[PDB]
Design an enzyme around this catalytic site. Structure first.
Site, PDB file in Angstrom:
ATOM      1  CG  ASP A  61      -5.450   3.135   0.709  1.00  0.00           C
ATOM      2  OD1 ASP A  61      -4.673   2.354   0.158  1.00  0.00           O
ATOM      3  OD2 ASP A  61      -5.120   4.115   1.366  1.00  0.00           O
ATOM      4  CB  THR A  98       0.076   5.483  -5.793  1.00  0.00           C
ATOM      5  OG1 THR A  98      -0.249   5.045  -4.442  1.00  0.00           O
ATOM      6  CG2 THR A  98       1.195   4.623  -6.486  1.00  0.00           C
ATOM      7  CB  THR A  99      -2.321   8.862  -2.437  1.00  0.00           C
ATOM      8  OG1 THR A  99      -2.854   7.571  -2.368  1.00  0.00           O
ATOM      9  CG2 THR A  99      -3.444   9.855  -2.012  1.00  0.00           C
ATOM     10  CG  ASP A 115       2.806  -0.542  -1.110  1.00  0.00           C
ATOM     11  OD1 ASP A 115       2.737   0.235  -2.096  1.00  0.00           O
ATOM     12  OD2 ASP A 115       1.738  -0.940  -0.532  1.00  0.00           O
TER      13      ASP A 115
END
Lengths: 73, 508, 513, 509
Positions: C47, C80-81, C381
């Protein structure tokens, strides 16, 4: 400066089209092309556009990047 | 021993000071480049800096010429205000032009006297350009807003700047001269307000009041004392020995609890219901104070207390055995307020006069500290403007003007220092080139035209190089006081000269 | 000097090169890492989000990437990524402009002007859903769940999230609702079915034995005091040098405490919660067993989180010693529940607490330690997506598809802007189009061909369509269930614009000594 | 083969120019330090000079930008005379100051365009520093003297310099109301002393014929002609070469003999006493002239024979196209006298008394040749100073005054042009610093003092490099003309701007 002067003329491209207003070409404080008095033939500038494009079309043609070491002699 | 010989000493002196110089030059002037300091050798972090104080101190000096300058400039920032960036950049710029001189072969004393006589010419020309703007006191207020406005910006603050212009001007103005960490005491805490600062009426103290000690005191009479028990008081019948075996380790701890009750009865005698001690105790000792009914307020500040003492006629001083030794301060209520979302014990009863307390609210501790230092330099400049209400137009407009006057005299007056008077003038103009290219104007073009204009008597127009344009400095407000600039110039010339004098460095 | 030129080129090289590696995001791409550390430990990672927060670097420019992810989680909790990869695009812009002879201060300025225009255009394309309306919230929550690991526990999770955030909410489009009010607790036992939303405040703690209050009426205890008993904080004149003498001191010590806990119960306590840090031993280890008897809850060596929540929400303030009697500044309460569920778990629920009109708590349950983990990420989330709407509403394309879309609209606005800044922003429009490209590139072999193609398919659809990034195929992207909040992409641009800008700003080497 | 991009080209160009500027900065002015000339590619023999002009010709250079400097130096030698070294140094200085501008960020055109406006300002300043002198005969004498003495020292010859200065100024003085050199003959000739020198008031052919032919004519009548005797100028009276016989070699020699004699007769028919011929006079017509009563001069010069024709009032025959039909010249007296250890022919009573010959008398060949050139550069100066009779205060006094003019301009300006103005002033000023080293007195003190004067406004103190101190200039033996200086300023600049502008140097070697 090249950036500064380019930016100046580009502003007047949005404000008005088909300009007699280019960059300085008498080394002046002002920038026009009616008061810098550079005119080309329409065909003359037209011929440049063709030619530049042309160079790209010629290098593209074959795929013979093969050389025996003879390629500029 | 080590001997670093005649050429080499001077070379170390030039590069070292140039490198430190280039750190504070970005932030200096209108908005251009900043420093973001990269920390890896102490600890691994990045830091957001804009103050010259932080940049210069935090990075060591290991180049011997470099040491002298960072120490002279740091003290100038305290006194003068904004002496950290200003002194270091000009001192560095002068050494660059020494480098030139020396390879050519001019003696170090020609250079030293040329720079010095040229500093006397700059100072005389700064006086010329400086004119009053404090001839009505309401006009004086406005003059101070401009000066203040300039310092504050080009130092990262979110919305705390906007308050501070008005704040600093109020504080200085009413007091007349002097320090102003006595006319506005800076309490820093985090609140629910993201970057807002306001004038408190009273002194407010951070710490929750819990337990049986009551959160609302009515009819406070405050007994001021600067010492007290850390958490345990030693005394005549306080001294004992109760520990010498392993079970006797808990028994002495029992005993220390008892010593806490002995200190309570000391205040009880006075009959003064509010006792302030500057040190914090724990939650457990607090129950004893609150029970008796002579309340202990711990973790008190000297600065807060001093604010109350001045209006009420109290005295800030230790010694207590009776309350007739140390004069009393007053407040009505000391009531637990919540400001932000943090619970505070707030003293309220007197307002203003000789001191206010200013409470800043952010959400990061970095913002508060950063804010104080910006503000600090400002208050110092405004302190000097009360004495000499002259003000002189800058942004780099001042620095070229003095340089023009120094170039004119550089031709006429001297017998051999001509080259050096000019070098002094060119170094002042180095500061307005560097900022030009950050702005998006041509350095060369800026320094060579307007310089003649402002000197002839268009002192208003000056350098607005946060946009790369010529703007009015009377209307845009990029004008600082006469005093602050006069002293940093003096300082920077001396500092360069000191290390320019050095032709051998011996290391033993 | 030569110190400013070389630092900017390398720092930009060094973040960007790591950002190239890192850009393998969305879907199955790149090849796994089993990692031999610089300290000799075996670590396995998957992830993109989890990696970036964890990432341990010492290159000053690369540290920016670590912390960029964390701010994003706190405002959005989404993307976030995403926020890192698009930041790497801005870095790609910075080199090409240095060669052109556009100065570094200028490239900073342009980032602001890129931000100002861009977010306004994001708001334009967006369809403005209501942040207090449940139906649209319910669709949006499905989008985030179905993009994570869950696809069958998704059913349970969508409705609990709409309810949870509803408790904390404030009507406005202004910044409200946080995970400083949304309290997230884990509990061993229960299942993903049994997850429970308590509208008040519930704290996560461990309570000794089973056999304690599970009924109504409680005075919630926030104490900061240690007992007075023989060989504690009260005098004893009995000094031990024997096992027998030791036995006496401890017996009389525990005995007095059995009396003490009755005064604690007199108060109404059915919940007592002990301070984190001792003032000797705090309430002794003997006191805790006696308290259990009175029917009164325990936790010594309490976590930090509980101390912050209790005081804020319920107004609960410290109280005086018990021999001196409690001060009664404690808040209101009416439930002391020890939550056991399928034979495991110890928990405190406080119902009938006072509130400021905020603060919900969700309890996260799972019959196995991994099964709790599976609920936990997915819910996080889903809570956060609905959250983002209150803070700033609307829905735009998801997966980072509007940053590709934004590129077309944005080139036009640069040309007509006709500044110094125009060239910097135009070049960034072309860089936002690389993000599905670069993602794929690293995985395999044959890079070039696919890379050009994905930019054609998205662009040609125009200002309202392109390729989807969660299904593929050229179809309408603005509403089709490939959505994310306005907040996620505006926030991402904003954070990126600040961190990157900072690399440009420095000059000359700097290293504290 | 190699394409040198604009920056890389700049460095080669700069280093080219500078290498040359060092040699000529040392040679500069009356106390300037010598050069050693080294003959390259062929032997390695040496001569010592103090002439900047000679450095370039003898010792060449393969740097493209440095070749421009050589072309420039040629132009001074002829047209102006002096200033061949004085220009070359300033041009290198202009480029030196250019270096810091190309580096900064500043393009070559910026530097060019602002030095053109600066050249116009410097010229205005050259007029101001130029005060009229030598309008009246007394002052006019004093006026030629100063310039001429300058030239010789700077191009080598400083020992016997004063004697030659008296004759040179007197020569130009006779002309009056015209800058001729087309009557002032320059004769350098072996024999005589280095101390003695002579100016004949007339015209003088140094060619002789011995005491075996007439040389005493009173009331002379001149025929100027180009008559072959073996060269065989047209009006043939001989034969064509043909070969028909094995004794035919004999026939040719005879046929030449009737030719020589028939031409003597046609000359004779003019009615003259003095015959001058540029060409050869064979042993046979020579004897026939000495008998006729006619003077024979053979091996006359192409310059002198023509130049003679004007002054005396004759006219040339032009390849013997006039055998009796060209007008004569006339002089009162033709005397042969011995001046030195030589026999000269002295034309006196010349029709245009403007004409003079300056006769240089060597006794070391090395001195005699170098002296001819240096004195020719000086006479080029002299004749331009007829057209405008004015001087500027030389010594470094003008250079500072041009520098300063341009410094006050520089200050006014804040544009793109303003940049180069700072550079230009510095460049002009950097010339007295060279003059200061040449003095041997430290530069910083003198040049700074000098600077100070000219700001306030004074051109009545200059640099005396002949006292090592800052001194008066009041038209002393160390001022320079306006004539030399205007051209030197113009060319240094013009050369430097061409070097700047060429940065697309493609070397195919």
């Amino acid at each position: 400066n090249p950036i500064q002067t380019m930016t100046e003329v580009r502003a007047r491209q949005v404000k008005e089209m088909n300009p007699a207003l280019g960059i300085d070409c008498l080394h002046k404080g002002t920038n026009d092309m009616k008061q810098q008095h550079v005119i080309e033939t329409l065909i003359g500038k037209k011929q440049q556009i063709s030619l530049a494009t042309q160079m790209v079309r010629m290098i593209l043609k074959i795929d013979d990047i093969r050389k025996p070491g003879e390629s500029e002699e | 021993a080590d001997e670093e010989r005649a050429e080499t000493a001077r070379l170390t002196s030039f590069i070292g000071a140039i490198a430190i110089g280039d750190l504070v030059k970005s932030t200096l002037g209108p908005k251009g480049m900043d420093k973001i300091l990269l920390s890896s050798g102490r600890d691994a972090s990045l830091m957001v800096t804009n103050d010259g104080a932080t940049i210069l101190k935090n990075i060591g000096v290991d180049n011997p010429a470099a040491k002298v300058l960072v120490d002279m400039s740091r003290v100038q920032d305290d006194e003068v205000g904004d002496g950290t960036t200003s002194v270091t950049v000009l001192a560095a710029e002068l050494l660059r032009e020494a480098e030139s001189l020396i390879a050519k072969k001019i003696h170090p004393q020609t250079i030293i006297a040329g720079w010095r006589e040229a500093t006397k010419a700059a100072r005389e020309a700064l006086l010329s350009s400086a004119v009053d703007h404090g001839s009505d006191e309401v006009k004086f207020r406005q003059d101070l807003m401009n000066i203040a406005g300039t310092t504050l910006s080009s130092k990262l603050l979110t919305h705390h700047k906007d308050h501070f212009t008005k704040l600093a001007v109020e504080a200085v103005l009413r007091l007349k001269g002097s320090g102003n960490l006595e006319a506005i005491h800076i309490i820093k805490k985090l609140g629910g307000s993201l970057a807002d600062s306001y004038l408190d009426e009273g002194f407010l103290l951070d710490k929750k009041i819990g337990v049986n000690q009551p959160k609302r005191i009515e009819n406070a009479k405050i007994l001021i004392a600067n010492t007290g028990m850390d958490t345990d008081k030693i005394k005549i019948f306080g001294s004992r020995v109760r520990v010498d075996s392993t079970a006797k380790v808990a028994e002495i701890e029992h005993a220390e609890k008892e010593k806490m009750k002995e200190k309570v009865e000391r205040i009880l005698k006075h009959g003064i219901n509010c006792f302030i001690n500057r040190q914090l105790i724990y939650n457990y000792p607090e129950q004893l104070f609150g029970a008796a009914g002579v309340m202990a307020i711990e973790h008190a500040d000297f600065a807060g207390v001093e604010r109350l003492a001045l209006v009420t006629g109290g005295e800030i001083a230790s010694t207590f055995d009776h309350p007739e030794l140390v004069k009393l301060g007053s407040c009505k209520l000391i009531e637990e307020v919540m400001i932000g979302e943090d619970k505070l014990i707030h003293f309220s009863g007197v307002a203003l006069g000789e001191a206010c307390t200013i409470v800043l609210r952010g959400a990061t501790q970095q913002i508060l500290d950063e804010a104080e230092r910006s503000l600090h330099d400002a208050l110092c400049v405004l302190a000097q403007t009360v004495k000499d209400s002259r003000t002189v137009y800058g942004g780099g407009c001042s620095e070229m003007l003095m340089a023009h006057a120094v170039t004119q005299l550089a031709n006429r007056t001297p017998g051999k220092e001509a080259v050096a008077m000019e070098s002094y003038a060119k170094a002042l103009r180095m500061l307005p080139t560097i900022i030009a290219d950050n702005a998006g104007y041509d350095s060369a073009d800026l320094v060579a035209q307007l310089r003649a204009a402002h000197s002839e008597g268009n002192t208003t127009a000056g350098l607005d190089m946060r946009e790369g344009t010529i703007g009015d400095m009377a209307i845009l407000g990029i004008t600082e006081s006469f005093q602050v600039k006069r002293q940093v110039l003096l300082s920077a010339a001396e500092a360069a000269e000191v290390i320019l004098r050095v032709d051998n460095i011996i290391k033993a | 000097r030569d110190k400013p030129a070389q630092i900017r080129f390398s720092n930009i090289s060094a973040a960007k090169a790591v950002a190239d590696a890192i850009r393998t995001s969305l879907g199955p791409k790149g090849m796994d890492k089993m990692i031999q550390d610089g300290k000799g430990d075996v670590t396995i990672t998957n992830d993109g989000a989890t990696i970036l927060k964890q990432m341990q670097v010492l290159h000053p420019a690369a540290r920016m990437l670590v912390e960029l992810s964390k701010a994003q989680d706190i405002e959005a909790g989404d993307g976030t990524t995403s926020v890192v990869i698009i930041a790497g695009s801005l870095l790609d812009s910075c080199t090409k402009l240095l060669q052109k002879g556009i100065h570094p201060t200028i490239i900073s300025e342009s980032f602001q002007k890129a931000l100002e225009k861009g977010i306004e255009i994001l708001t334009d394309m967006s369809r403005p859903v209501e942040l207090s309306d449940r139906e649209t919230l319910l669709n949006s929550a499905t989008t985030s769940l179905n993009s994570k690991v869950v696809s069958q526990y998704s059913s349970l999770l969508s409705p609990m999230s709409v309810n949870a955030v509803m408790k904390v909410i404030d009507p406005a489009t202004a910044t409200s609702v946080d995970l400083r009010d949304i309290k997230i607790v884990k509990k061993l036992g229960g299942t993903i079915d049994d997850c429970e939303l308590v509208e008040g405040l519930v704290l996560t703690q461990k309570v000794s034995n089973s056999g304690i209050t599970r009924v109504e009426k409680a005075k919630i205890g926030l104490i900061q005091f240690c007992l007075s008993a023989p060989k504690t904080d009260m005098d004893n004149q009995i000094v031990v040098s024997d096992y027998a003498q030791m036995d006496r001191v401890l017996r009389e010590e525990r005995a007095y405490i059995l009396n003490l806990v009755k005064q604690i119960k007199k108060t109404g306590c059915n919940v007592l919660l002990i301070q984190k840090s001792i003032l000797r031993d705090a309430l002794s280890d003997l006191a805790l067993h006696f308290l259990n008897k009175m029917k009164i809850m325990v936790i010594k060596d309490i976590e930090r989180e509980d101390i912050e929540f209790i005081c804020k929400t319920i107004g609960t303030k410290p109280v005086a010693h018990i021999d001196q009697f409690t001060a009664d500044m404690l808040g209101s309460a009416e439930l002391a529940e020890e939550v056991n569920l399928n034979g495991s778990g110890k928990l405190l629920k406080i119902t009938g607490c006072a509130s400021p009109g905020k603060t919900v708590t969700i309890v996260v349950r799972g019959s196995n330690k991994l099964v709790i983990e599976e609920a936990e990420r997915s819910i996080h989330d889903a809570l956060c997506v609905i959250r983002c709407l209150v803070k700033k509403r609307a829905l735009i394309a998801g997966g980072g598809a509007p940053e590709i879309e934004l590129a077309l609209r944005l080139t036009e606005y640069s040309r007509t802007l006709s500044g110094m800044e125009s060239y910097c922003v135009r070049a960034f429009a072309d860089a936002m189009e690389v993000i599905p490209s670069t993602l794929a590139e690293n995985a395999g072999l044959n890079p070039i061909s696919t890379v050009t193609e994905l930019r054609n398919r998205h662009a040609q659809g125009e200002k309202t369509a392109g390729i989807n990034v969660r299904k593929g195929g050229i179809s309408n992207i603005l509403e089709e269930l490939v959505v994310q909040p306005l907040l996620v992409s505006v926030s991402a641009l904003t954070l990126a614009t600040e961190t990157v800008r900072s690399i440009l700003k420095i000059d000359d080497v700097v290293n504290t000594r």
